[PDB]
Backbone as ProteinMPNN parsed JSONL, in Angstrom:
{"seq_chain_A": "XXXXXXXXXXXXXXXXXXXXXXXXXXXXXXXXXXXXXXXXXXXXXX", "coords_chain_A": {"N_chain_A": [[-24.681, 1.416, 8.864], [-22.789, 4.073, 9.687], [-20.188, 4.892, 11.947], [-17.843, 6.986, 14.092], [-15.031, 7.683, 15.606], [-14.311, 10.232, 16.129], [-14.215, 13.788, 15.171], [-12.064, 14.563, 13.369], [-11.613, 11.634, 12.248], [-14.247, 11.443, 11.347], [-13.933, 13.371, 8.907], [-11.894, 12.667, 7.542], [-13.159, 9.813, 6.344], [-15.242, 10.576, 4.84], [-13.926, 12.561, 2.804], [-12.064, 9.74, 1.863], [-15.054, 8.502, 0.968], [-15.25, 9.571, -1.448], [-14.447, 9.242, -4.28], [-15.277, 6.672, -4.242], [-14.699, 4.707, -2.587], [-14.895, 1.712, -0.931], [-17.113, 1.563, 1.898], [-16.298, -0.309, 4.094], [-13.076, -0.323, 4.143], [-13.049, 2.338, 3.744], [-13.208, 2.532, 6.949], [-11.483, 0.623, 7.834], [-8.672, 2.521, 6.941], [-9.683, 5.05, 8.484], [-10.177, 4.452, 11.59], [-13.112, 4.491, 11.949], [-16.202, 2.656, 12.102], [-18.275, 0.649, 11.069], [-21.685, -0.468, 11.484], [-24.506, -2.599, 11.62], [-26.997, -1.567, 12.845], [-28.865, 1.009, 13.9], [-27.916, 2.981, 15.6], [-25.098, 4.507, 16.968], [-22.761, 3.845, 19.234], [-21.643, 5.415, 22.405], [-18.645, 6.176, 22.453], [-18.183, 6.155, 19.476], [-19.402, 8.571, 18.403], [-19.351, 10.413, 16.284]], "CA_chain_A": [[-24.533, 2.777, 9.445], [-21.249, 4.545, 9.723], [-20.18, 5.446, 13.864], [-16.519, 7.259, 13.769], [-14.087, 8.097, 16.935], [-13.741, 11.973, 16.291], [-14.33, 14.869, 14.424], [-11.049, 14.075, 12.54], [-11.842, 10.613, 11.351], [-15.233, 11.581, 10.01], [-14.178, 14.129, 8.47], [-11.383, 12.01, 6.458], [-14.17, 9.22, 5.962], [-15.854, 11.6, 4.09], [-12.974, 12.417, 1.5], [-12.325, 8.933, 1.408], [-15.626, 8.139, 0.139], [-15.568, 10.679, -2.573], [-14.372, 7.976, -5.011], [-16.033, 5.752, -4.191], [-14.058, 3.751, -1.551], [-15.758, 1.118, -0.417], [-17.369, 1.742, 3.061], [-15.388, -1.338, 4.704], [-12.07, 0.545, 3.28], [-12.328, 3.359, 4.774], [-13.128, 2.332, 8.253], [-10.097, 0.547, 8.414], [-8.286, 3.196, 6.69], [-10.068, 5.839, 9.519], [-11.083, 4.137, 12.907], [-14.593, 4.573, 11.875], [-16.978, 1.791, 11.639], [-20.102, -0.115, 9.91], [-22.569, -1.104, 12.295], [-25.817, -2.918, 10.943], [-27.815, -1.316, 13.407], [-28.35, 2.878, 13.512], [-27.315, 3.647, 16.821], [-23.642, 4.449, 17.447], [-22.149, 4.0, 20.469], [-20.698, 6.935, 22.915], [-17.208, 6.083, 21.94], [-18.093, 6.346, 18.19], [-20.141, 9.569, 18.559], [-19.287, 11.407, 15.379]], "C_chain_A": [[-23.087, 2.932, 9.795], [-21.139, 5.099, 11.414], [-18.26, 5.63, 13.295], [-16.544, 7.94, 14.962], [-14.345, 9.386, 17.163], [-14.145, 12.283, 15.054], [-13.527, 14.274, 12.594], [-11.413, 12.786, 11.565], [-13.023, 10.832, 10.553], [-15.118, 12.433, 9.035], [-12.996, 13.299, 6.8], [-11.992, 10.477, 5.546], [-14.472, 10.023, 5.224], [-14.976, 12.031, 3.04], [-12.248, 11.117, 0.774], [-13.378, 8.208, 0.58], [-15.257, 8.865, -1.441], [-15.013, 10.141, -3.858], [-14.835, 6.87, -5.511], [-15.924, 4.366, -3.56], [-15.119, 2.747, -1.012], [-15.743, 1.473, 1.641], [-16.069, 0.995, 4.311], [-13.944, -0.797, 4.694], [-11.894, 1.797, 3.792], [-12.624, 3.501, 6.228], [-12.355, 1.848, 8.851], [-9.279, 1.641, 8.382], [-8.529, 4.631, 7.536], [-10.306, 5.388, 11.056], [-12.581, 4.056, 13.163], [-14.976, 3.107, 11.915], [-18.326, 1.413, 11.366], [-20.453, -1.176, 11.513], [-23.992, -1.834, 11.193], [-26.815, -2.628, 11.368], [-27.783, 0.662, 13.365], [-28.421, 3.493, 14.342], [-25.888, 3.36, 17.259], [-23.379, 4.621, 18.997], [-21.78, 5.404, 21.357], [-19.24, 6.91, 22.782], [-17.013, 6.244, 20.583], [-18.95, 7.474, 18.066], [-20.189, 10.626, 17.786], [-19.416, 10.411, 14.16]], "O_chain_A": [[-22.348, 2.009, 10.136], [-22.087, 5.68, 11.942], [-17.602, 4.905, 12.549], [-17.483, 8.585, 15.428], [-14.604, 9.762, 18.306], [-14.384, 11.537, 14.105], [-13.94, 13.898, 11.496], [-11.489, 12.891, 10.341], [-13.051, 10.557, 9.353], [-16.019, 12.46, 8.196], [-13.217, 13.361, 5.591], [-11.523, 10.077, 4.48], [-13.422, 10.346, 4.67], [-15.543, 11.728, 1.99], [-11.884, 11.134, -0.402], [-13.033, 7.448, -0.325], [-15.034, 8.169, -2.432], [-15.267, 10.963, -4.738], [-14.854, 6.299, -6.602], [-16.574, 3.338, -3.751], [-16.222, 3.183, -0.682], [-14.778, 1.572, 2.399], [-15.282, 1.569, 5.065], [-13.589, -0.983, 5.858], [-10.839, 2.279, 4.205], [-12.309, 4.562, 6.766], [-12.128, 2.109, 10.032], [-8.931, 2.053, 9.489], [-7.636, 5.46, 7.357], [-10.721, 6.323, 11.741], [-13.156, 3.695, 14.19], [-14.059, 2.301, 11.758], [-19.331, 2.1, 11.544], [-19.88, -2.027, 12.193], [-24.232, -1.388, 10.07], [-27.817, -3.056, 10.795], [-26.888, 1.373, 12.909], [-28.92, 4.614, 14.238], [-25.507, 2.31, 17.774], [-23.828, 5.501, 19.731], [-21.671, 6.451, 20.72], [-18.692, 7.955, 23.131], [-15.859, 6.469, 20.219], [-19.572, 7.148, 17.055], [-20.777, 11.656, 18.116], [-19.412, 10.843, 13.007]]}, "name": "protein", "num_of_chains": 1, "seq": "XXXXXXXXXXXXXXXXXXXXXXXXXXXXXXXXXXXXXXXXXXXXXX"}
């Protein structure tokens, strides 16, 4: 599961995939991140 900071980062997650970026790849590349579970945090809330 994907959990991202802000608006902003998910929204450039999201044009990052569109390639086909690997997940891992663009969570560095955004602040976002891969959880293995499918509840994000309140600090990752978008």
């Amino acid at each position: 599961t994907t959990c991202c900071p802000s608006i902003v980062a998910r929204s450039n997650f999201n044009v990052c995939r569109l390639p086909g970026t690997s997940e891992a790849i663009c969570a560095t590349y955004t602040g976002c991140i891969i959880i293995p579970g499918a509840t994000c945090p309140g600090d990752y809330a978008n």
